[PDB]
Structure 1
Amino acid sequence: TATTLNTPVVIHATQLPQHVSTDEVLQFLESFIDEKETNLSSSISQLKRIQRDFKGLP
């Protein structure tokens, strides 16, 4: 479970969230997936599935 070693003491948004186009979501997924190549493995796997959908696939 959560300790000061794996969890931020506090988190705050500094701005209102800005919506992003599909073309942007794709450019971000692209680079984030590349840069990060057990929990992280199974997660980029899922991201890989999402980027697949944003390109229209299965």
Structure 2
Amino acid sequence: MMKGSRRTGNNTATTLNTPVVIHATQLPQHVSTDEVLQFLESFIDEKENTNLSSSISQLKRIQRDFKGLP
């Protein structure tokens, strides 16, 4: 049978793709409103000094999120 064997071509859930273990080190602190603006406005310019540019406009779909024309 094939569909149990083409899982090995579809999944690709490697250790290069995911970290081994993520642990929260502290309890989550609810942020305010304006710093979510003040984060995301500075988050977009990260890799913008390749791929990741289908996701850059996904990151630039985060751009419009609070000040555009929804």
User: Do they superpose with TM above 0.5?
Assistant: yes
Of 33, 44, 63 in structure 2, the residue corresponding to residue 22 of structure 1 is 33
Query: By percentage of residues, which structure has more helix?
Result: 1
The TM-score with structure 2 as length reference comes to: 0.61
Q: Is there any run of 5+ residues in structure 1 with no aligned partner, and where?
A: none
Q: Is there any run of 5+ residues in structure 2 with no aligned partner, and where?
A: 1-11
In terms of mean alpha carbon deviation, does 46-55 or 21-30 score higher? 46-55
Q: Which runs of 4+ in 1 moved over 6 A?
A: none
Equivalenced residues, count: 58
Query: Highest Rg: 1 or 2?
Result: 2
Give how far 1:44 is off.
3.6
Query: By percentage of residues, which structure has more strand?
Result: 1
Residue 29 and residue 55 in structure 1: after superposition, are their counterparts in 2 closer, same or farther (change >3 A)? same
Question: Is 2:59 aligned against 1:47?
Answer: yes
Identical columns (%): 100
Give how far 1:34 is off.
1.1
Residue 17 and residue 53 in structure 1: after superposition, are their counterparts in 2 closer, same or farther (change >3 A)? same
Q: RMSD across aligned C-alpha pairs, in angstroms?
A: 2.0
Flag the structure with more relative contact order, 1 or 2, with Cα contacts below 8 A and sequence separation at least 6: 1
